[PDB]
Amino acid sequence: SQQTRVLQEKLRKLKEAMLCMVCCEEEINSTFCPCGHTVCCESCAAQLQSCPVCRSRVEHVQHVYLPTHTS
Amino acid sequence: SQQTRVLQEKLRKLKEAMLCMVCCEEEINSTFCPCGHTVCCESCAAQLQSCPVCRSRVEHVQHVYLPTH
Ligand SMILES: [Zn+2]
Ligand SMILES: [Zn+2]
Ligand SMILES: [Zn+2]
Ligand SMILES: [Zn+2]
Numbered sequence: 001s002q003q004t005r006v007l008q009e010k011l012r013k014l015k016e017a018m019l020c021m022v023c024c025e026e027e028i029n030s031t032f033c034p035c036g037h038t039v040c041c042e043s044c045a046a047q048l049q050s051c052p053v054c055r056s057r058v059e060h061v062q063h064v065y066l067p068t069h070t071s
Numbered sequence: 072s073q074q075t076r077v078l079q080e081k082l083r084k085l086k087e088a089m090l091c092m093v094c095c096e097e098e099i100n101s102t103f104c105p106c107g108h109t110v111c112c113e114s115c116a117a118q119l120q121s122c123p124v125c126r127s128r129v130e131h132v133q134h135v136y137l138p139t140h
Contacts, residue, residue: 001072004074004075004078007075007082014082015085017139018139021138028137031133035136036133038135038136062107062133064135066110067088067092067099067110068088068089
């Protein structure tokens with residue numbers, strides 16, 4: 001039904017919000033510290049000097065284990 | 072259809088996986104450091120001296136800003 005299409009779209013959008021903002025291919029699993037923005041996979045987060053969201057200096061990257069992880 | 076019920080269940084399970092594993096009421100927004108388990112809201116994470124997943128000592132809690140919030 002049309003209701004099925006609406007639910008498919010909500011699911012797709014939620015799952016797309018879980019992917020890296022830089023490569024769009026791998027799941028987000030890394031946090032820039034101390035700002036806390038958690039928007040990148042480990043590879044893309046590794047060479048950034050400043051946060052791509054708020055421009056704060058990245059002192060270090062903290063790996064995150066999220067219950068939503070499926071890759 | 073039956074597919075509408077199947078999609079409703081998938082959406083419910085994904086939304087539940089984004090909720091605090093302790094209180095089941097608020098969104099996950101906190102990481103236990105240094106282990107990295109990110110399974111609690113800020114109120115439950117403030118009250119735990121040990122990680123509820125791996126039992127490692129919590130040295131500090133890091134707030135996380137997730138695009139899904
Ligand atoms: Zn990436
Ligand atoms: Zn930031
Ligand atoms: Zn909680
Ligand atoms: Zn842990």
